[PDB]
Every structure is written in C-alpha cells, then in structure tokens.
C-alpha cells in the first residue's frame, strides 16, 4: 500500500495498549520530505484473532482514504512482516481529554489555564468538521470520544483512533457481551442492538462537546458501569448541563441524545449550529 520501513522507526514512549496491540510514539526518519525525522503515532497488531484483523483493516482503509485538517493522516503502513504497523500522524501535545484535565484542575487553588466559551467551541467545531468528512465518506468511527482526540500546544484538533483500553483508558470502557465498549459514549441502539451508523457517531459527538464543557469530567460519573447501562436501557441516560454551556449549546447535545437516530442532527446541522456561536 503506502510501504513504510519499519527500521526506519525509533521508538521513544509507550501510549499503551488497545485490542490489537501496542501504541506507541516513535521518530519516522525520513517519513516526509524534507524533514529527517518525523514524530509519529504507531499502532501495532499483536492480535491473530479474526475480529481484531478485521477492525486494524477498517482503521487503516478509513485514514487511508480521508484527507482533512481536523484528522490524523495514516503516514505509513508495515505490513512486510510480523507485526503488522499501522503509522499515524501525531501532534506537539496529546490526547484531547489530557489537555481538557490540565487547563483546569478540579483543585482552584493550583495554576490553571481554563478554556473560555470561544475556545470550548472552537475546540467542538474542528471535530464537527472532521466528523462531517469522515461522515461525507461513508465511514462510522464508532470509538469518538476526546481520549481518541488529539490536541497541539495552540488547540489544532485532529479525529485518531487510540483505543487504549486496557490500561491508560480502562476506565472507559467496559465488559459486555464478550467485547469492551466505550459505554458512557454509545447511544442505545449502538450498544444494545450492535447498530453504528453516522447518527450513534453523532451520540457520541454530543457526549464529546460535554466532556469539553467539563474541562474532561467523566460522562456520568459517581454511577457505576452497571447503573450506566441499567439507565441507557430504560431511557432515563441524561448528561447535565454543564456551568458555562450557553442553553443554545446544551439544547444542541440534547438532540445528539435523541432516542431516535431519526432525530438527531447530521454532522453538516451540527458544523452549522457550531458556527452560530
């Protein structure tokens, strides 16, 4: 495909682990030209189970194909010899939800940076934008959730596909029929009836625009796991309206919420919405 040597990587920290292997940062000598080395995001396929070959496969074709600012390009693939690496762009800083966490500490008493409204919603509309790209595609991500977002020093945003959930994201994902599920993102017929489409995508966006008004709070936090699921099954799954989310915005992530995937906005309604602000 879009051959890259592996001997040409340097490994420099590990991000953690998904279903399918290691995710690592490494320097990409001679990745791009002109530049000798390129920081770059790996992923790796340590995984020989059918499912896992399938979904590595569906990530590298969905990057492969897309070509948008708001996200990450796939630089790279290693699929010569075992393991398989699927090579990402990276960014100067991390995951957008670290990036949430550190601008304003639940501590008030600690240096802070907090985001202002402008920049909450600046920070909402480059992942409307890259949503709506990769929705125009025909593509679902299916995992949209700020840890799978990635964030420079001057808040440039870019759609990845991390998945760290067996050790950094654990927390996040939880252990239902036989799979890990990003639970406190997913809309019922996503979860409940294994049905992804662009509108469960669009759940998930809403859920994202909450997690950036709280500074990267945790969706429904205080309940378990089980008290989640219990609530998205009886329709009674109901975020807050976070202090300093203006009631035209919150309005909005209530109708992501729809019961409905009939109901909720497209990707292009929400980048419209977003541009009102």
Known sequence: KMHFPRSSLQPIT??????????????????????????????????????????????????????????????????EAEPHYMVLEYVDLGDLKQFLRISKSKDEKLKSQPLSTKQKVALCTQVALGMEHLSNNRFVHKDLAARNCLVSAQRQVKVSALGLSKDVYNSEYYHFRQAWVPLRWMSPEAILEGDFSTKSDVWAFGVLMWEVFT???????????????????????????????????????QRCWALSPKDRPSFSEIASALGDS
Do not use: I, W
């Open 14 to 79: 590990t991000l953690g682990k998904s279903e399918f292997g290691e995710v690592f940062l490494a320097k990409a000598q001679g990745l791009e030209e002109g530049v000798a080395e390129t920081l770059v995001l790996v992923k790796s396929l340590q995984s020989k189970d059918e499912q896992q070959q399938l979904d590595f496969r569906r990530e590298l074709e969905m990057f492969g194909k897309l070509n948008h600012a708001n996200v990450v390009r796939l630089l790279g693939l290693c699929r």
């Open 215 to 253: 500074h990267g709070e945790m969706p429904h936090g205080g309940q378990a796991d089980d008290e989640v699921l219990a609530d998205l099954q009886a329709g009674k799954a109901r975020l807050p309206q976070p202090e300093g989310c203006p009631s035209k915005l919150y309005r909005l992530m």
